[PDB]
Design a protein around this ligand. Sequence first.
Ligand SMILES: [Cl-]
Ligand SMILES: [Cl-]
Ligand code: NA
Length: 264
Amino acid sequence: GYARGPDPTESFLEADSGPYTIATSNVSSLVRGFGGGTIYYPVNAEGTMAAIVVIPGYMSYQSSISFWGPRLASHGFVVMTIDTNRISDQPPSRRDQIEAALEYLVDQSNSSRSPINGMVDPNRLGAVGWSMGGGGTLRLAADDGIQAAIGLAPWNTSSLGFRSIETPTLIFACERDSIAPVRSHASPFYNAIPSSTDKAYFEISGGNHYCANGSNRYDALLGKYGVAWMKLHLDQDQRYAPFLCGPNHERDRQISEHRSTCPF
Ligand SMILES: [Cl-]
Ligand SMILES: [Cl-]
Ligand code: NA
């Protein structure tokens, strides 16, 4: 139904680019509800696709998470990397801005003045967030405001609001993070989510707080698991399940811990 692109392999998922060529459109900060952004989208994709917003953390701009724009969009997604209204915004505000940015993509898909006209399926929305942007992403997931969530070294004041999330949620934890220490953020966030929810935890060995932002030594792993997550849950594309459920991920020197509720 929603599956697109060729049958995946490990090499295909590890490559810097997926099989679609992509284009970009800039969104001015004048946009209501967030600080503007960059839309990345496939050029020759038939029909509608899931849409994903990617948000950075405290004191950071869109460029800090830009890897995720081309990496997801080149696999058949409409992906907007955003700025927040202020770089000092906290996770509750970031949650609202992710929601506003997804609404913007849905609305532009219905506008005859948009280059992404007809590209977004409003039923299929995801978010990816780093640090406080990950707290915002998990907060939106707690309302079922998204169909898939990825947290990149997430930071939030508490885990206690996350105990009923049903949104399929992947958390990348950076083992040696001193800004959002895994023991106080990523790990309790993952453990708070119900065991009946599709969820996964990938802790990157030795990882610094920026480890899951990509454009770095972990690109093959980050994109493989992140794309597979969005394919499996936003596209219901079961071809991607074997990359997430089955492998002994911890054998990889880059993965110090893996948890999941596989099989999904
Ligand atoms: Cl918070
Ligand atoms: Cl760090
Ligand atoms: Na704005």
